[PDB]
Amino acid sequence: VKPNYALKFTLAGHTKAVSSVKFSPNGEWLASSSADKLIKIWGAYDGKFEKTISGHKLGISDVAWSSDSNLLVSASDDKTLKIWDVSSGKCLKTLKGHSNYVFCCNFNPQSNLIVSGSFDESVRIWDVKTGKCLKTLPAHSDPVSAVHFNRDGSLIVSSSYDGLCRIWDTASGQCLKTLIDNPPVSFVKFSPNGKYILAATLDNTLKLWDYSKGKCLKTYTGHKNEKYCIFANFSVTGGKWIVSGSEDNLVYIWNLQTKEIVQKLQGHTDVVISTACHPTENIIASAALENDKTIKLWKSDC
Ligand SMILES: CN1CCN(c2ccc([N+](=O)[O-])cc2NC(=O)c2ccccc2Cl)CC1
């Protein structure tokens, strides 16, 4: 079987490159961040604009939801993260401490912690309630491209231009594993069950790792990725897919097990830097850079 993703909605509004799209855990909303300094919220099913969230002084690289879908965290060129109340649009906390651009961010499942990665080569862990930086991890020797908590929050995975993926004990702050040619690692995330890590490198390659055995189980190629830190995803609502943007302006979909490309989605007119998979429906959101500036919503039967 192969999926049949068809374009349903194009969401215009951002005035610069869109950096990140994320579906809310409860499936109602899509949040988008942009170099235009703005966060925008959209209805996930009808693509209808909901609100604009403003406050950051410079462009925003990433946005992430709390488990209850009530809060957002953003990561900005202004060296801060901000925590937002989604319903009011209000900035609740500004997370200060990174010495350079913040590129990536995530809540833990418990949503009492935030993790962030910066151009400053560190990974920071923040208390959501107080805004205080609890730990600064000397994670990498180059900009940190991605940070993600595993399913139980006990682990953090980080990736960097230094060519390394690292797994950290959240509680102890110590490095549990280093996956080490080492081309820049531009993306990393845990699988839904926490057993695997999907990692992208800037040599046109995505890899699925069993990090406990430290072994590469699958490779996904055929797409273009040598410049931009492009977000990838596990698609699990229907067929079991791998989804990624690409520098040829397409969204690529692979069969996770066989590694064959099952679909390529055309429509965008610039690099697709971010994709998101809806938590319950077979819906993909994709976002493109400055020649495009739109988010597209795609729907499949499997
Ligand atoms: C969702 N992902 C999170 C991680 N991310 C990222 C990773 C690595 C580096 N870097 O080491 O250069 C830079 C960026 N950010 C930007 O490229 C960017 C920054 C501000 C505004 C717009 C954009 Cl697109 C891209 C989006």
User: DSSP states of the chain as a string?
Assistant: -----EEEEEE---SS-EEEEEE-TTSSEEEEEETTS-EEEEETTT--EEEEE---SS-EEEEEE-TTSSEEEEEETTS-EEEEETTT--EEEEE---SS-EEEEEE-TTSSEEEEEETTS-EEEEETTT--EEEEE---SS-EEEEEE-TTSSEEEEEETTS-EEEEETTT--EEEEE-----EEEEEE-TTSSEEEEEETTTEEEEEETTTTEEEEEE-SS--SSS---EEEE-SSS-EEEE--TTS-EEEEETTT--EEEEE---SS-EEEEEE-SSSSEEEEEE-TTT--EEEEE---
CA–CA distances in Å: residue 283 to residues 161, 189, 249 = 31, 19, 19
Cα(106) to centroid(ligand 1), Å: 14
User: Side chain identity at 179, as an amino acid letter?
Assistant: L
Among 184, 182, 176, 171, which Cα is nearest to 157's? 176
Side-chain half-sphere exposure of 281, counting CA atoms within 13 A: 17
For this entry, resolution in Å reads 1.8
What 116-122 contacts at long range (C-beta under 8 Å, 24+ apart), as own/partner pairs, is 116/75, 116/81, 116/147, 117/143, 117/144, 117/145, 117/146, 117/147, 117/158, 117/160, 118/79, 118/143, 118/144, 119/143, 119/144, 121/160, 121/162, 122/98
Cα(30) to centroid(ligand 1), Å: 19
Task: Report which ligand 1 atom has the smallest distance to the Cα of 63.
Answer: 1
Which two tokens mark 225? Answer: 């990725």
CA–CA distances in Å: residue 211 to residues 60, 157, 239, 252 = 30, 10, 24, 24
Quote the CA–CA distance of 106 and 88 in Å, as a whole number: 21
Among 128, 159, 163, which Cα is nearest to 144's? 159
Which two tokens mark 210? Answer: 């069993």
CB 104 less than 6 A from any atom of ligand 1: yes
**Phi-psi region at 97: left, alpha or beta (left = phi > 0; alpha = psi -120 to 50):** left
Number of domains forming the structure of the chain: 1
Task: Report which ligand 1 atom has the smallest distance to the Cα of 76.
Answer: 20
CATH number at residue 221: 2.130.10.10
Domain limits at 147?
1-302
CB 273 less than 6 A from any atom of ligand 1: yes
CB 275 less than 6 A from any atom of ligand 1: no
Total residue length of the chain:
302
The answer to whether the CB of 132 falls within 8 A of the CB of 112 is no
Task: Report which ligand 1 atom has the smallest distance to the Cα of 19.
Answer: 24
User: Side chain identity at 299, as an amino acid letter?
Assistant: K
The answer to whether the CB of 166 falls within 8 A of the CB of 104 is no
Burial (Cβ within 10 Å: 0-12, 13-18, ≥19) of residue 258: exposed
Per the listing, tokens 């590694």 go with 259
Quote the CA–CA distance of 101 and 103 in Å, as a whole number: 6
User: Side chain identity at 111, as an amino acid letter?
Assistant: S
Return all residues near 126 (Cβ < 8 A) that are at least 6 apart. Answer: 81, 95, 113, 114, 115, 116, 132, 133, 134
Order of strands across the sheet that contains 102-107: 102-107, 113-118, 123-127, 133-137
Quote the CA–CA distance of 226 and 50 in Å, as a whole number: 34
Cα(103) to centroid(ligand 1), Å: 5
Task: Report which ligand 1 atom has the smallest distance to the Cα of 161.
Answer: 11
